[PDB]
Short mmCIF file of C-alpha atoms in Angstrom, two decimals:
data_model
loop_
_atom_site.label_atom_id
_atom_site.label_comp_id
_atom_site.label_asym_id
_atom_site.label_seq_id
_atom_site.Cartn_x
_atom_site.Cartn_y
_atom_site.Cartn_z
CA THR A 1 80.78 95.87 76.18
CA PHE A 2 79.08 97.58 79.09
CA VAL A 3 75.97 99.60 78.19
CA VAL A 4 66.74 96.20 84.82
CA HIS A 5 64.86 93.24 83.28
CA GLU A 6 67.42 93.05 80.45
CA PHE A 7 70.26 92.18 82.86
CA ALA A 8 68.53 91.03 86.07
CA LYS A 9 66.45 87.91 86.78
CA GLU A 10 63.08 88.54 88.44
CA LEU A 11 63.17 86.21 91.44
CA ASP A 12 60.11 84.54 92.94
CA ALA A 13 60.01 85.79 96.54
CA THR A 14 58.89 82.31 97.65
CA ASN A 15 62.48 81.17 96.89
CA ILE A 16 64.00 83.81 99.22
CA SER A 17 64.39 83.45 102.99
CA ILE A 18 65.98 85.88 105.47
CA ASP A 19 67.92 84.60 108.50
CA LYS A 20 70.06 87.59 109.57
CA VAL A 21 69.58 91.36 109.54
CA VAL A 22 72.97 93.05 109.30
CA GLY A 23 71.88 96.69 109.49
CA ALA A 24 70.77 99.81 107.62
CA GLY A 25 71.84 100.64 104.08
CA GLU A 26 71.60 103.72 101.87
CA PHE A 27 68.20 102.81 100.41
CA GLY A 28 66.87 100.47 103.13
CA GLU A 29 67.76 97.34 105.10
CA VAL A 30 70.65 94.94 104.50
CA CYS A 31 70.50 91.26 105.49
CA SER A 32 71.52 87.76 104.48
CA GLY A 33 69.61 84.61 103.82
CA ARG A 34 69.08 81.78 101.39
CA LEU A 35 67.93 81.49 97.79
CA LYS A 36 66.32 78.39 96.27
CA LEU A 37 67.46 78.15 92.64
CA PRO A 38 65.23 76.78 89.85
CA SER A 39 67.18 73.48 89.99
CA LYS A 40 66.30 73.29 93.74
CA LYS A 41 69.87 73.97 94.86
CA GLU A 42 70.00 76.27 97.90
CA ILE A 43 72.67 78.96 98.27
CA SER A 44 73.49 81.70 100.75
CA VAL A 45 72.84 85.22 99.50
CA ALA A 46 73.14 88.84 100.50
CA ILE A 47 69.80 90.68 100.33
CA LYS A 48 69.21 94.41 100.14
CA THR A 49 65.71 95.97 100.43
CA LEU A 50 64.26 99.30 99.32
CA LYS A 51 62.75 101.28 102.23
CA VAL A 52 59.00 101.46 102.65
CA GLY A 53 57.73 104.80 101.30
CA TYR A 54 60.53 105.09 98.74
CA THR A 55 60.49 107.87 96.14
CA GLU A 56 60.58 107.07 92.41
CA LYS A 57 64.12 108.47 92.27
CA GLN A 58 65.16 106.20 95.17
CA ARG A 59 63.72 103.16 93.36
CA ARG A 60 65.56 104.11 90.15
CA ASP A 61 68.87 104.71 91.95
CA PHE A 62 68.57 101.46 93.97
CA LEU A 63 67.64 99.22 91.02
CA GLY A 64 70.21 100.99 88.82
CA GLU A 65 72.88 99.01 90.70
CA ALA A 66 71.35 95.77 89.44
CA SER A 67 71.21 97.08 85.84
CA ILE A 68 74.98 97.55 86.03
CA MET A 69 76.02 94.50 88.13
CA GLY A 70 73.91 92.15 86.04
CA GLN A 71 76.00 92.91 82.94
CA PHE A 72 79.02 91.27 84.50
CA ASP A 73 79.68 87.57 84.94
CA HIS A 74 83.13 86.95 86.34
CA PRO A 75 84.53 85.11 89.38
CA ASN A 76 86.03 88.31 90.83
CA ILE A 77 82.94 90.50 90.35
CA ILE A 78 80.07 90.17 92.82
CA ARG A 79 77.36 88.06 91.22
CA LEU A 80 73.81 89.35 90.89
CA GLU A 81 71.37 86.50 91.61
CA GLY A 82 68.44 88.76 90.72
CA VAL A 83 65.86 91.27 91.86
CA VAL A 84 62.34 91.30 93.30
CA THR A 85 60.18 94.08 91.88
CA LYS A 86 56.72 92.49 91.45
CA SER A 87 56.22 92.42 95.23
CA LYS A 88 57.31 94.85 97.91
CA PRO A 89 59.72 95.39 99.58
CA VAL A 90 61.79 95.62 96.39
CA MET A 91 65.00 93.54 96.67
CA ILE A 92 68.46 93.07 95.18
CA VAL A 93 69.93 89.61 95.80
CA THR A 94 73.66 89.08 95.41
CA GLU A 95 76.51 86.71 96.18
CA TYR A 96 77.04 86.02 99.90
CA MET A 97 80.54 86.99 101.08
CA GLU A 98 81.19 85.59 104.54
CA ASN A 99 84.13 87.81 105.42
CA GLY A 100 82.60 91.12 104.37
CA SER A 101 84.50 94.22 103.28
CA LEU A 102 88.20 93.70 102.69
CA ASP A 103 89.50 96.75 104.56
CA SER A 104 87.65 95.88 107.79
CA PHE A 105 88.57 92.20 107.46
CA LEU A 106 92.29 92.97 107.12
CA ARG A 107 92.23 95.38 110.07
CA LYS A 108 91.01 92.48 112.26
CA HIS A 109 93.94 90.33 111.07
CA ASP A 110 96.91 92.69 111.11
CA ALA A 111 100.10 90.88 110.04
CA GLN A 112 98.36 87.47 110.13
CA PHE A 113 98.39 86.43 106.45
CA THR A 114 101.29 85.24 104.36
CA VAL A 115 102.52 87.43 101.52
CA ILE A 116 101.32 84.80 99.04
CA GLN A 117 97.81 84.92 100.57
CA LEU A 118 97.77 88.72 100.19
CA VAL A 119 99.03 88.47 96.60
CA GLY A 120 96.24 85.99 95.82
CA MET A 121 93.69 88.50 97.09
CA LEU A 122 95.27 91.21 94.95
CA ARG A 123 95.37 89.01 91.84
CA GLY A 124 91.63 88.35 92.17
CA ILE A 125 90.89 92.05 92.42
CA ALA A 126 93.09 92.75 89.37
CA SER A 127 91.37 90.01 87.37
CA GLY A 128 87.92 91.47 88.14
CA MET A 129 89.17 94.90 87.10
CA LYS A 130 90.67 93.50 83.88
CA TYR A 131 87.18 92.28 82.97
CA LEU A 132 85.47 95.56 83.91
CA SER A 133 87.97 97.52 81.86
CA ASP A 134 87.61 95.05 78.96
CA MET A 135 83.89 95.87 79.09
CA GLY A 136 84.61 99.62 79.07
CA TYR A 137 83.25 100.10 82.59
CA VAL A 138 85.16 102.67 84.65
CA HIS A 139 84.42 101.92 88.28
CA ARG A 140 85.53 105.29 89.79
CA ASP A 141 85.28 104.06 93.39
CA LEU A 142 87.73 101.15 93.51
CA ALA A 143 88.80 100.94 97.19
CA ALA A 144 89.34 98.12 99.67
CA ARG A 145 86.01 99.02 101.36
CA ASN A 146 84.30 98.19 98.03
CA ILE A 147 85.97 94.79 97.72
CA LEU A 148 84.21 91.86 99.41
CA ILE A 149 85.97 88.69 100.55
CA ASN A 150 84.46 85.22 100.87
CA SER A 151 85.09 82.23 103.15
CA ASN A 152 87.97 81.06 100.92
CA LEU A 153 89.57 84.56 100.84
CA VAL A 154 88.48 85.17 97.23
CA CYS A 155 88.11 88.92 96.66
CA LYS A 156 85.45 90.40 94.41
CA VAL A 157 84.71 93.90 93.18
CA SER A 158 81.46 95.40 94.50
CA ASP A 159 79.65 98.79 94.60
CA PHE A 160 78.08 99.40 91.20
CA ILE A 161 89.78 111.93 96.92
CA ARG A 162 92.17 109.38 98.47
CA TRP A 163 91.50 106.76 95.78
CA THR A 164 91.16 109.09 92.80
CA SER A 165 93.88 109.77 90.23
CA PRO A 166 95.28 113.31 89.98
CA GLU A 167 93.75 113.92 86.52
CA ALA A 168 90.32 112.69 87.68
CA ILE A 169 90.53 115.11 90.64
CA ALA A 170 91.80 117.97 88.45
CA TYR A 171 89.25 117.82 85.63
CA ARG A 172 87.12 114.67 85.95
CA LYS A 173 89.26 112.67 83.51
CA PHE A 174 88.03 109.18 84.47
CA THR A 175 89.40 106.29 82.39
CA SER A 176 90.50 102.72 83.01
CA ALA A 177 93.91 104.24 83.82
CA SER A 178 92.34 106.22 86.68
CA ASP A 179 90.97 102.88 87.93
CA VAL A 180 94.58 101.55 87.73
CA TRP A 181 95.60 104.46 90.00
CA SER A 182 92.86 103.37 92.43
CA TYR A 183 94.09 99.78 92.19
CA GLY A 184 97.52 101.00 93.32
CA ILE A 185 95.85 102.51 96.37
CA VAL A 186 94.05 99.19 97.03
CA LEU A 187 97.41 97.41 96.74
CA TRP A 188 98.76 99.74 99.44
CA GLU A 189 95.64 99.16 101.57
CA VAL A 190 96.03 95.39 101.37
CA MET A 191 99.75 95.36 102.14
CA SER A 192 99.04 97.77 105.03
CA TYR A 193 96.25 95.53 106.44
CA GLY A 194 93.53 98.10 105.92
CA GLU A 195 95.24 101.31 107.00
CA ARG A 196 93.48 104.38 105.58
CA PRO A 197 95.29 105.83 102.53
CA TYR A 198 96.92 109.15 103.52
CA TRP A 199 95.58 108.59 107.06
CA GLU A 200 93.52 111.69 108.03
CA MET A 201 95.51 114.26 106.04
CA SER A 202 93.53 117.35 104.98
CA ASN A 203 91.99 116.64 101.55
CA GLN A 204 93.66 119.73 100.08
CA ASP A 205 97.01 118.34 101.24
CA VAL A 206 96.33 114.89 99.75
CA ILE A 207 95.63 116.65 96.44
CA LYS A 208 98.70 118.93 96.62
CA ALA A 209 101.19 116.34 97.91
CA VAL A 210 100.26 113.82 95.22
CA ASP A 211 100.51 116.54 92.56
CA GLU A 212 104.01 117.45 93.84
CA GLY A 213 105.11 113.82 93.34
CA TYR A 214 104.66 112.53 96.88
CA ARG A 215 103.39 108.97 97.26
CA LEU A 216 102.30 106.70 100.05
CA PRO A 217 105.35 105.09 101.71
CA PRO A 218 106.12 101.37 101.54
CA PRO A 219 104.01 99.37 103.96
CA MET A 220 105.96 97.54 106.66
CA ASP A 221 107.82 94.52 105.25
CA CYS A 222 106.46 95.22 101.74
CA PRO A 223 108.11 93.24 98.93
CA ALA A 224 110.05 95.56 96.59
CA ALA A 225 108.18 94.16 93.60
CA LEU A 226 104.84 95.17 95.16
CA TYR A 227 105.93 98.67 96.16
CA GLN A 228 107.30 99.18 92.65
CA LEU A 229 103.92 98.02 91.29
CA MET A 230 102.22 100.67 93.47
CA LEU A 231 104.57 103.35 92.12
CA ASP A 232 103.83 102.19 88.56
CA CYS A 233 100.07 102.42 89.17
CA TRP A 234 100.69 105.93 90.54
CA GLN A 235 102.57 107.31 87.53
CA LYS A 236 101.70 110.97 87.00
CA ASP A 237 101.34 110.29 83.26
CA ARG A 238 98.31 107.97 82.95
CA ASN A 239 99.72 106.56 79.69
CA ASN A 240 102.70 105.20 81.68
CA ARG A 241 100.54 103.18 84.10
CA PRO A 242 100.25 99.44 83.47
CA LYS A 243 97.04 98.02 82.00
CA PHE A 244 95.06 95.63 84.16
CA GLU A 245 96.16 92.68 81.99
CA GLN A 246 99.76 93.62 82.79
CA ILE A 247 98.99 93.86 86.51
CA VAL A 248 97.44 90.38 86.47
CA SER A 249 100.54 89.04 84.67
CA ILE A 250 102.91 90.74 87.14
CA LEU A 251 101.08 89.18 90.09
CA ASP A 252 100.90 85.76 88.40
CA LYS A 253 104.70 85.87 87.98
CA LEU A 254 105.14 86.67 91.69
CA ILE A 255 102.86 83.73 92.58
CA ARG A 256 104.88 81.50 90.19
CA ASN A 257 108.20 82.72 91.65
CA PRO A 258 107.43 83.29 95.37
CA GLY A 259 111.15 83.78 96.11
CA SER A 260 110.89 87.13 94.32
CA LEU A 261 108.70 88.37 97.20
CA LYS A 262 111.63 87.91 99.64
CA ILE A 263 113.30 91.07 98.29
CA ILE A 264 111.96 93.64 100.73
CA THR A 265 111.78 97.42 99.90
CA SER A 266 114.51 99.69 101.13
CA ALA A 267 112.36 101.77 102.43
CA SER A 268 103.10 108.19 108.46
CA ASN A 269 105.10 110.39 106.06
CA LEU A 270 104.87 110.57 102.25
CA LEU A 271 107.85 109.82 100.01
CA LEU A 272 108.79 111.99 97.04
CA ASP A 273 108.46 109.89 93.86
#
């Protein structure tokens, strides 16, 4: 069950080296480097720093991420290596993911992966979400931009209206079933190679169209089984959406029977139901 020092290792800064500054982040700089583990193994890591002259609120909000991430240990959830708090700048050190955010990565590779490669990505995301939901953690911001992808194309959940379920928009009813709605949107994003859900529709229209029963259309050459899975994730009644365990099983069956993916749906305009 989901509930800083309790869930995060205090790293010795002598074991951390920086070799690339990526850019600015919400609370400070973002870079990558190397971490020397206690066993002397050396690994690549992502490193995030807290800005000089931080406020106490900023420190709390920044480190709060580690207090959440550190509770999870799963191959499809970004791993927290630890934090540095006893020296400044304060740091969060996480799993290095060579290929960055999934949405941006897919946009660079439009139509260049096999369907089975895409399904593997999606199965990883679903497995990570099955564990988060098993822990009682509702992510609330599941989106391809918050999925990271490594050198072997393994996708992992990160970040601890377009993606939000209708009931969560209407009255802040956030549950694991609203995360399943979001997963359906991620499924569409992946099969669309990182197209923006609902493009640049007015937010009021995204809300109204979805409420009226309109859904994102099938991505080009989308397997029928995968578009149906999207529609299932987007059931108006949250009790009728699949659980994450069911999503993982559905995708595992498609991987086991790749021929099933050859059945292509029939089917920038939304489709009613």
